[PDB]
Amino acid sequence: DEDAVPTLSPCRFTGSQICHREDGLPLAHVAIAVEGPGWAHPDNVALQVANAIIGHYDCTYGGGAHLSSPLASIAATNKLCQSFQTFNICYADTGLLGAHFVCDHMSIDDMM
Amino acid sequence: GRQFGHLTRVRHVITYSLSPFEQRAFPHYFSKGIPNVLRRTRACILRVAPPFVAFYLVYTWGTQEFEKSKRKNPA
């Protein structure tokens, strides 16, 4: 026990952008998120339900146009991406809440 | 034509950016600000100023010669 045991200091979420441009790759990856509350917050359940409503998509999904999620359905119908996924990464007191997606160079705007 | 997505080809360049709600709109406004402007002035005076003073001299002279040509002494 005793001396030399630190606690974790909170981590400042910044809200910024990091764009690694590389036209040599054939599909773009994009990951956007806002700051999440973290592990213990009861708010996580509701956050997880809204995410579930947006859900995920992948080009091998059966049922495209008829999918419940408007994102997925519009995505599937207009071929706006190859895949997307919502997420809620929890860390102590903070987190990443958002979605990630993969798409053609001319679809990033629409997908966003 | 035009449009993003079809402008040109670029690879290997990263760009770090920051939300405007996270930074100040006037960082070191006078601190770095004024030095810069002096620098820019210095960078361009020798190219911009000379024609203007040349006009200025021709302006004040030309004016004096006009006024002083319309008086007479002997003859």
Curated annotation (Swiss-Prot), chain A:
Q: Which family is this protein grouped under?
A: Belongs to the peptidase M16 family. UQCRC1/QCR1 subfamily.
| Annotated keywords | Acetylation, Electron transport, Membrane, Mitochondrion, Mitochondrion inner membrane, Phosphoprotein, Respiratory chain, Transit peptide, Transport
Quote the range of the complete protein represented: 258 to 369 of 480
Signal sequence segment: none
**Segments passing through the bilayer:** none
Q: What is this protein called?
A: Cytochrome b-c1 complex subunit 1, mitochondrial
Instruction: Kindly list the places in or outside the cell where this protein is found, as annotated in its UniProt entry.
Output: Mitochondrion inner membrane
One GO CC annotation: mitochondrial inner membrane
Supply one GO molecular-function term. metal ion binding
Q: How does it assemble?
A: Component of the ubiquinol-cytochrome c oxidoreductase (cytochrome b-c1 complex, complex III, CIII), a multisubunit enzyme composed of 11 subunits. The complex is composed of 3 respiratory subunits cytochrome b, cytochrome c1 and Rieske protein UQCRFS1, 2 core protein subunits UQCRC1/QCR1 and UQCRC2/QCR2, and 6 low-molecular weight protein subunits UQCRH/QCR6, UQCRB/QCR7, UQCRQ/QCR8, UQCR10/QCR9, UQCR11/QCR10 and subunit 9, the cleavage product of Rieske protein UQCRFS1.
Report the protein's function.
Answer: Component of the ubiquinol-cytochrome c oxidoreductase, a multisubunit transmembrane complex that is part of the mitochondrial electron transport chain which drives oxidative phosphorylation.
Q: Which gene encodes it?
A: UQCRC1
UniProtKB/Swiss-Prot annotation, chain B:
Keywords recorded for this protein, A-Z? Acetylation, Electron transport, Membrane, Mitochondrion, Mitochondrion inner membrane, Respiratory chain, Transmembrane, Transmembrane helix, Transport
Q: Which cysteines are joined by disulfide bonds?
A: none
Q: Name one Pfam family in it.
A: UcrQ
Topology in membrane: Single-pass membrane protein
A GO term (biological process) for this protein?
Answer: midbrain development
Taken from the record's topology, the Mitochondrial matrix segments are 1-38
InterPro entries linked: Cyt_bc1_su8, Cyt_bc1_su8_sf
Where is this chain primarily localised? mitochondrion
Q: Which residues carry this modification: N6-succinyllysine?
A: 32
Q: Which GO terms describe its cellular component?
A: mitochondrial inner membrane; respiratory chain complex III
Cell compartments where the protein resides = Mitochondrion inner membrane
Q: Which Gene3D superfamilies match?
A: Cytochrome b-c1 complex subunit 8 (1.20.5.210)
**N6-acetyllysine is carried by which residues?**
32
Regions crossing the membrane: 39-67
Q: What does this protein do?
A: Component of the ubiquinol-cytochrome c oxidoreductase, a multisubunit transmembrane complex that is part of the mitochondrial electron transport chain which drives oxidative phosphorylation.
Assembly state and interactors?
Answer: Component of the ubiquinol-cytochrome c oxidoreductase (cytochrome b-c1 complex, complex III, CIII), a multisubunit enzyme composed of 11 subunits. The complex is composed of 3 respiratory subunits cytochrome b, cytochrome c1 and Rieske protein UQCRFS1, 2 core protein subunits UQCRC1/QCR1 and UQCRC2/QCR2, and 6 low-molecular weight protein subunits UQCRH/QCR6, UQCRB/QCR7, UQCRQ/QCR8, UQCR10/QCR9, UQCR11/QCR10 and subunit 9, the cleavage product of Rieske protein UQCRFS1.
The UniProt entry's sequence similarity note says: Belongs to the UQCRQ/QCR8 family.
Record's protein name:
Cytochrome b-c1 complex subunit 8
State the taxonomy lineage: Eukaryota, Metazoa, Chordata, Craniata, Vertebrata
